[PDB]
Amino acid sequence: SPEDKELLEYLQQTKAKITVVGCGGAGNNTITRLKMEGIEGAKTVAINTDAQQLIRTKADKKILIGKKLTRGLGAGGNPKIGEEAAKESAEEIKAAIQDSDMVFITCGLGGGTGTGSAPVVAEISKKIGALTVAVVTLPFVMEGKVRMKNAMEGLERLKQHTDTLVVIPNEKLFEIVPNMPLKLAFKVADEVLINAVKGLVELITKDGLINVDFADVKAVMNNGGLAMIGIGESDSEKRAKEAVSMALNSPLLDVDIDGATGALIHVMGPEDLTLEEAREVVATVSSRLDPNATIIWGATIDENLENTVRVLLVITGVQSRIEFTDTGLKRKKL
Amino acid sequence: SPEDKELLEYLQQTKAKITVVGCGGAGNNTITRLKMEGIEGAKTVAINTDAQQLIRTKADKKILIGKKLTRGLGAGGNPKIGEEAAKESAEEIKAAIQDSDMVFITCGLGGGTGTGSAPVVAEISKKIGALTVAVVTLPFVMEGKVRMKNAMEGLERLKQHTDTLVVIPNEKLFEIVPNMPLKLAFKVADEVLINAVKGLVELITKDGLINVDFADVKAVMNNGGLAMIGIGESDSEKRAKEAVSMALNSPLLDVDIDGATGALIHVMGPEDLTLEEAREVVATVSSRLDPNATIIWGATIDENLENTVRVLLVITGVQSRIEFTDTGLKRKKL
Amino acid sequence: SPEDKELLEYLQQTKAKITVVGCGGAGNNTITRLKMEGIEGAKTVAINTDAQQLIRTKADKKILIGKKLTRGLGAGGNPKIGEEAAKESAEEIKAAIQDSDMVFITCGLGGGTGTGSAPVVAEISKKIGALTVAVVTLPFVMEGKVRMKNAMEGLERLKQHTDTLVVIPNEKLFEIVPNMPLKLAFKVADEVLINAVKGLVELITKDGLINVDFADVKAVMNNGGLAMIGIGESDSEKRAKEAVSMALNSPLLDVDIDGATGALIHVMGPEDLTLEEAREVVATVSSRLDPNATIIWGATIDENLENTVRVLLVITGVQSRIEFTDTGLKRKKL
Ligand SMILES: Nc1nc2c(ncn2[C@@H]2O[C@H](COP(=O)(O)OP(=O)(O)O)[C@@H](O)[C@H]2O)c(=O)[nH]1
Ligand SMILES: Nc1nc2c(ncn2[C@@H]2O[C@H](COP(=O)(O)OP(=O)(O)O)[C@@H](O)[C@H]2O)c(=O)[nH]1
Ligand SMILES: Nc1nc2c(ncn2[C@@H]2O[C@H](COP(=O)(O)OP(=O)(O)O)[C@@H](O)[C@H]2O)c(=O)[nH]1
């Protein structure tokens, strides 16, 4: 029977179905790059309340949300509209992430479409029973108080309908290249973003020097509460050791990780990458979290990655370590 | 791309998408006429719990609701059944008004299908984020106490899922042609209805001596609370002046309009209609509402409208001026 | 018009649309038999969280629920998973029972897919406004305390989204053939089940010596609260009298029926079945319930039913007569 045959086939699926949804201009901007630089095994869905941005975007599926609310003309920086536009198009959004086993909601918090629609796309995803993960940034302080109070509130809302929520405070990007002209500001942030997102998807989707079990990912990530990134990499010949300290020290991991469970580690390096450098990476890390943290890791080889090995680090469940003030992420004072 | 092309096209839409849903026998009866006399740019959806009436109706789309509840055999005057039949067919109803920018729910309150299903079609419409407007009548007192207590309760329910709700008390039709035999009763009511409904749709959809901005309509109507009609027209040569006083005095505007915001004014007249008579119309009106009422108006020319100019008047947000007793609309006593 | 023609046709439907949904292994097992032995006018839908069982099943439609939650690999005896798998696939489940006028949810309570998914399929059915009926069993005591505490809780949950819920305690199967080896245990239970389910469907769907009005069924069954079965049959020549006492005495009707309203009686017999034996059957029964119980009955002739007449008995609204302890159905002590 065509139903039995279909059933049989189902059992043969070997790969997890990952869909990436970018919201608003920045999120669409991100989707456009993954769609070009390629995002190993993942479909891209861009959703915007602004038709012009949506149109100049490159994605697998485009959805103009808020068609009656907005008119294809933007949400004017208003999270309330981003939200209704998304609520108004729930069906359509859900129909795009419907078959995904895992869904990543990415965007720049602070605007109206992203800040308002991300929590909506997230709650819709959770309903269809998918692994809901958000890799989202916080505005630069230069952008002002209203942009951040809005970003904060969005983060809070996004917290409730998210399995794991990865926050990247653009402000620390300045702790990485101190005298950056706002120009690069958003170009650096663009980079960090595409890394955090691609680093995570491939860690789960790209064949490495280890089989990384989606069932494990789902296990851990199912409870990443509030996670934070760490990126590091060494040109030198003591790579692993330097790439993981860089990472463990990135100003992006702006949190006290001592009391942290779960972690996802992706070491990427050239063909001369060793399962041992990977392990070095993993233990230097394991050595700093709760003694029982569940750690997911993988190791992939990157063509264009010269003599270097990057080390993406996603430390989860740090929400008790942080303070959600409507002025930003404040490292908790107990 | 077919998605981009589509997106582009979207931006070119110039006309608001209006769908008119008539519920129950009277509502279906109304839809049948708009479908014939033509309702400038608006699709008609008739929904009934009675297959026989539905069948003899003329509409763009027909929906037999309550197919399992009822069996295509009516709701026997019961609002409770009108409601479940509609709740039972929500999906189907929603699929018919799904793309509308604006939805009009029309019916004769007092029966079972209309009284029960109108609030359901209204809440469904609001969910899809459309401009939900109801042009609905109240039964004649001859019909009795049960018919009205049911109509009242329906009006209340309809209040919660409606952007603006236009009430037409058939009882005042007698204040217009005093010794009317019940025959005409429903023939007069039929007229007033088709006017209130067509007058409003064309005001928004028919090209006049002024561009009427749907964005303005949505603004005002988005808050018409409880509205009431006024119809007037003058054969004479001081038209505007006579047509707007007639209107301002119609026994149908059975409410204290002094404290009213928003209003929609549609003056229709022969080709010799002036933008000035229209303005006369509008100011005589503006002069009687809150000094800051938002007034939407338009002016269209009607072929078959001899030497006359009709003046439809929809005064909104008068709900504080009225008393909802389960015996009818009582002009509030503060 | 194709819409009018369609409407017309609708009015001509003469038969109620019955869909039977079996959940989990036992439920799928049951569906497989009705699908083969044939279930007079009823479509079969098998739903399972385990692909292997689903595949070896025979049904009109198969649905693998919990595809993201479970992975086509079972629910491991967990009701919590049976539930999420079903909640996760609500749309798909609903799309299969969507046009039914009546829906039967059948399964063996105690496992994870059935116990968890039956209440979900039931609440979904009630939403589409269908006659929701469950013919479900309770585990044998040999299976242990956890299997039953889970079955009990499922029964409770199933109570809330069910029009009438028919419980068959497998434990009393031993009061019928006392020294049964667990082998037959489940083979006897298999029989009783296929009878209770087919007996009820045909009583409503198979042409007998009486027109049984679906409108009556819906009336009664709409309020069967907690029902219990009785099966009996006589080889002899005083059939009716013996078949109805057997039935009235079956250890399966483990409840005090004196205070019971409604009942459904299906007497099946050979071609020499009399409308009078049927009436004998019905009055011996009527004589023992509340003096105003609404009794639905029918009478059908069965080819392969030698000189015998079976008598299926479904006595409804006995929930006040029973005690729901998380160790089984205890005949209430007031
Ligand atoms: N990385 C990155 N962030 C951006 C970019 N443009 C804007 N943002 C950030 O994202 C936030 C929202 O901007 P935008 O994406 O335009 O918002 P929306 O379209 O209204 O949802 C801002 O507060 C910025 O910090 C961009 O090109 N790259
Ligand atoms: N204008 C108008 N009103 C009607 C007509 N028939 C009934 N009504 C009114 O509408 C109410 C409901 O009647 P009907 O449309 O038959 O109700 P339903 O079909 O049961 O929902 C009555 O109480 C009447 O006042 C009609 O032909 N024209
Ligand atoms: N009649 C019958 N009952 C069964 C059969 N297998 C299991 N059961 C009963 O149904 C309950 C659930 O078993 P199963 O159908 O495997 O559960 P599930 O697949 O996990 O939902 C058990 O506790 C048994 O009492 C069978 O073949 N026939």
Buried b (16+ CB within 10 A) or exposed e, A204-216: bbbebbeebebeb
Chain C residues close to A128, C-beta within 8 Å = 68, 88
d(CA A195, CA A229): 10
**SS3 at position A22:** strand
**SS3 at position B334:** coil
**SS3 at position A140:** coil
Judged on CB neighbours under 10 Å (0-12, 13-18, 19+), C286 is middle
d(CA C68, CA A216): 14
Helices in chain A by DSSP H: which ranges? 2-12, 24-37, 51-55, 79-88, 90-97, 113-127, 145-160, 182-205, 214-221, 239-249, 275-286
d(CA A44, CA A103): 10
Beta bridge partners of A309: A234
According to the annotation, is A26 in a ligand binding site? Answer: yes
**Other CB atoms within 10 Å distance of the CB of residue C142:** 11
Please indicate whether, in this complex, the C-beta atoms of A88 and B4 are within 8 angstroms of each other: no
Residue C236: both structure tokens together: 């002899």
**SS3 at position A46:** strand
Cα first-last separation, chain A: 62
- In the chain, the amino acid numbered B50 is D
d(CA A329, CA A170): 11
Q: How many CA atoms does the CB half-sphere of C168 hold within 13 Å?
A: 28
Spatial contact of A174 and A250, defined as CB atoms under 8 Å apart: no
What's the gap in Å between B25 CA and the centre of ligand 2? 6
Does ligand 2 come within 6 angstroms of the Cβ of B24? yes
CA-based nearest distance A129→chain C, Å: 6
H/E run at residue A143: none
Radius of gyration of chain B (CA): 19
What's the gap in Å between A108 CA and the centre of ligand 1? 5
d(CA A90, CA C312): 48
- In the chain, the amino acid numbered A254 is D
Spatial contact of B254 and B166, defined as CB atoms under 8 Å apart: no
What is the DSSP annotation of B37-83? H--SS-EEEEEESBHHHHHT---SEEEE--TTTS-BB--TT-HHHHH
What's the gap in Å between A185 CA and the centre of ligand 1? 11
Does ligand 3 come within 6 angstroms of the Cβ of C290? no
**SS3 at position A301:** strand
Handedness of CA B287, B288, B293, B298 (dihedral sign): negative
The answer for residues whose C-beta is within 8 angstroms of residue B43's C-beta and 6 or more apart is: B18, B19, B20, B60, B61, B100
Residue A197: both structure tokens together: 């997102």
Tokens 């005896």 -> residue: C77
- C partners (3+ CB pairs within 8 A) are A, B
Judged on CB neighbours under 10 Å (0-12, 13-18, 19+), A3 is middle
Handedness of CA A170, A172, A177, A182 (dihedral sign): positive
Strands C295-301, C226-234: pairing kind: unpaired
* Length, in residues, of chain B: 334
| Closest listed residue to residue A159, CA positions, set A227, A258, A63 | A227
Spatial contact of C194 and C33, defined as CB atoms under 8 Å apart: yes
Please indicate whether, in this complex, the C-beta atoms of B72 and C7 are within 8 angstroms of each other: yes
Ligand closest to C83 (CA) is 3
Q: Which residue owns the Cα nearest ligand 3 atom 13?
A: C111
Tokens 């692993």 -> residue: A240
Residue A120: phi and psi, rounded to 5, are -70, -50
d(CA B38, CA B1): 37
**Which residue among A52, A53, A78, A137 is best mutated to probe the pocket of ligand 1, counting the most ligand atoms within 8 A of its Cβ?**
A137
Residue B103: both structure tokens together: 């939805």
- Measured from the CA of B170, which atom of ligand 2 is nearest? 25
Method: X-ray
**SS3 at position A106:** strand
Chain C residues close to A10, C-beta within 8 Å = 51, 64, 67, 72
The answer for residues whose C-beta is within 8 angstroms of residue B167's C-beta and 6 or more apart is: B136, B137, B138, B155, B226, B227, B228, B329
* B8 touches A: beta carbon within 8 Å: yes
Residue B110: both structure tokens together: 């007092």
Please indicate whether, in this complex, the C-beta atoms of B54 and C7 are within 8 angstroms of each other: yes
**SS3 at position B102:** strand
d(CA B318, CA B296): 16
Diameter over CA atoms, chain B: 66
| Closest listed residue to residue A239, CA positions, set A200, A196, A288, A273 | A273
Spatial contact of B43 and B19, defined as CB atoms under 8 Å apart: yes
Spatial contact of C273 and C262, defined as CB atoms under 8 Å apart: no
| Reported structure resolution in angstroms | 2.8
Handedness of CA A97, A101, A107, A113 (dihedral sign): positive
Spatial contact of B286 and B220, defined as CB atoms under 8 Å apart: no
Order of strands across the sheet with C164-169? C61-64, C43-48, C18-23, C102-108, C131-138, C164-169, C226-234, C309-315, C263-269, C295-301
Please indicate whether, in this complex, the C-beta atoms of B130 and A68 are within 8 angstroms of each other: yes
What is the DSSP annotation of B261-323? --EEEEEEE-TT--HHHHHHHHHHHHTTS-TT--EEEEEEE-SS-TT-EEEEEEE---TTTEE
Beta bridge partners of A324: A329
What is the DSSP annotation of B164-188? EEEEEEGGGGGGTSSS--HHHHHHH
Please indicate whether, in this complex, the C-beta atoms of C130 and B69 are within 8 angstroms of each other: no
Q: Number of CB pairs < 8 Å for A and B?
A: 26
Instruction: List B residues 108-167 in contact with A (Cβ-Cβ < 8 A).
Output: 128-130
H/E run at residue A101: none
DSSP state of B104: E
Does ligand 1 come within 6 angstroms of the Cβ of A29? yes
d(CA A51, CA B237): 50
**Which residue among A55, A186, A192, A229 is best mutated to probe the pocket of ligand 1, counting the most ligand atoms within 8 A of its Cβ?**
A186
d(CA A272, CA A276): 11
d(CA C45, CA C59): 6
* B11 touches A: beta carbon within 8 Å: yes
H/E run at residue B329: strand B328-331
d(CA A328, CA A152): 6
Residue C47: phi and psi, rounded to 5, are -130, 135
Q: Number of CB pairs < 8 Å for B and C?
A: 26
* A9 touches C: beta carbon within 8 Å: no
Give chain A's count of helices (H) and strands (E).
Answer: 11, 12
A55 to chain B: closest CA residue? B4
d(CA B197, CA B200): 5
Ligand closest to B80 (CA) is 2
Cα A251 from chain centre = 17
According to the annotation, is C256 in a ligand binding site? Answer: no
Judged on CB neighbours under 10 Å (0-12, 13-18, 19+), B95 is middle
Selecting from B54, B64, B68 the residue whose C-beta is nearest the C-beta of C101 gives: B68
**SS3 at position A298:** strand
Spatial contact of A102 and A204, defined as CB atoms under 8 Å apart: yes
What's the gap in Å between C25 CA and the centre of ligand 3? 6
A9 to chain C: closest CA residue? C51
Strands B43-48, A322-325: pairing kind: unpaired
Spatial contact of A293 and A223, defined as CB atoms under 8 Å apart: no
Give chain B's count of helices (H) and strands (E).
Answer: 11, 12
CA-based nearest distance A37→chain B, Å: 20
| Closest listed residue to residue B331, CA positions, set B250, B233, B231, B255 | B255
Spatial contact of A121 and A105, defined as CB atoms under 8 Å apart: yes
- In the chain, the amino acid numbered C205 is T
Ligand closest to A32 (CA) is 1
Please indicate whether, in this complex, the C-beta atoms of B129 and A64 are within 8 angstroms of each other: no
A6 to chain C: closest CA residue? C55
Spatial contact of B97 and B123, defined as CB atoms under 8 Å apart: no
Report CA dihedral (B316, B321, B326, B328) to the nearest 10 degrees. Answer: -70
What's the gap in Å between B43 CA and the centre of ligand 2? 22
d(CA A290, CA A284): 13
Beta bridge partners of C324: C329
* CA geometry: angle B287, B291, B292, nearest 5 deg: 125
Order of strands across the sheet with B43-48? B61-64, B43-48, B18-23, B102-108, B131-138, B164-169, B226-234, B309-315, B263-269, B295-301
Chain C residues close to B84, C-beta within 8 Å = 129
d(CA A222, CA A130): 10
d(CA C82, CA B327): 52
Q: Domains of chain C by range and CATH?
A: 16-227 (3.40.50.1440), 228-334 (3.30.1330.20)
Please indicate whether, in this complex, the C-beta atoms of A11 and C72 are within 8 angstroms of each other: yes
Q: How many CA atoms does the CB half-sphere of C39 hold within 13 Å?
A: 29
**SS3 at position B136:** strand
- B partners (3+ CB pairs within 8 A) are A, C
Chain C residues close to A11, C-beta within 8 Å = 51, 72
Residue B172: both structure tokens together: 């005042």
Q: CA A46 → CA A22, A62, A67, A93, distances in Å?
A: 5, 5, 15, 10
* A55 touches C: beta carbon within 8 Å: no
Site from C31, C71, C87, C117 to mutate, A interface, most A CB atoms within 10 angstroms = C71
Q: CA A143 → CA A109, A166, B101, C125, distances in Å?
A: 12, 21, 35, 52
The answer for residues whose C-beta is within 8 angstroms of residue B328's C-beta and 6 or more apart is: B138, B141, B148, B152, B169, B171
Q: CA A313 → CA A106, A139, A249, A256, A295, distances in Å?
A: 17, 21, 10, 14, 11
Three-state SS string across chain C, please? CHHHHHHHHHHHCCCCCEEEEEEHHHHHHHHHHHHHHCCCCCEEEEEECEHHHHHCCCCCEEEECCCCCCCEECCCCCHHHHHHHHHHCHHHHHHHHCCCCEEEEEEECCCCHHHHHHHHHHHHHHHCCCEEEEEEEECCHHHCHHHHHHHHHHHHHHHHCCCEEEEEEHHHHHHCCCCCCHHHHHHHHHHHHHHHHHHHHHHHHCCCCCCCCHHHHHHHHCCCCEEEEEEEEECCCCHHHHHHHHHHHCCCCCCCCCCCCCEEEEEEECCCCCHHHHHHHHHHHHCCCCCCCCEEEEEEECCCCCCCEEEEEEECCCCCCEEEECCEEEECCC
Residue C111: both structure tokens together: 């496992």
- In the chain, the amino acid numbered B232 is G
d(CA C220, CA C294): 7
Site from C1, C4, C6, C7 to mutate, B interface, most B CB atoms within 10 angstroms = C7
| Closest listed residue to residue A312, CA positions, set A222, A217, A221, A246 | A246
Please indicate whether, in this complex, the C-beta atoms of B72 and C10 are within 8 angstroms of each other: yes
